[PDB]
């Protein structure tokens, strides 16, 4: 019954990245001291 209008989204930059890994094998200890 009217004329709806949309809004242009603000461009955003976050640097490309590949897809994350499901297993995520990383270091086994957390903490600077060792």
């Amino acid at each position: 019954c009217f004329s709806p209008k949309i809004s242009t989204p603000k461009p955003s930059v976050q640097a490309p990245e590949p897809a994350p890994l499901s297993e995520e094998v990383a270091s086994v200890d957390i903490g600077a001291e060792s």
Binding site: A26, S27, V28, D29, I30
Partner: protein
């Protein structure tokens, strides 16, 4: 594992009490059991399981 009989019975009893099915209580137990443990399989074409352990006898560090 002989170390997990105590709690499996209690989970089964709780589900049977909370609902009415005697066959939806045997299925929800297995999900918990299979989400807490690890299974090994043989190298032949057939895949019969040959073991079952728990996910804290295998941790190496403090990473979860």
């Amino acid at each position: 594992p002989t170390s997990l009989d105590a709690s499996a019975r209690k989970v089964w009893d709780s589900w049977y009490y909370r609902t009415g099915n005697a066959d939806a209580a045997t299925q929800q137990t297995q999900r918990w059991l299979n989400e807490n443990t690890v299974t090994f399989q043989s190298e032949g074409s057939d895949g019969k399981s040959i073991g079952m352990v728990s996910k804290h006898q295998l941790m190496v560090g403090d990473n979860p």
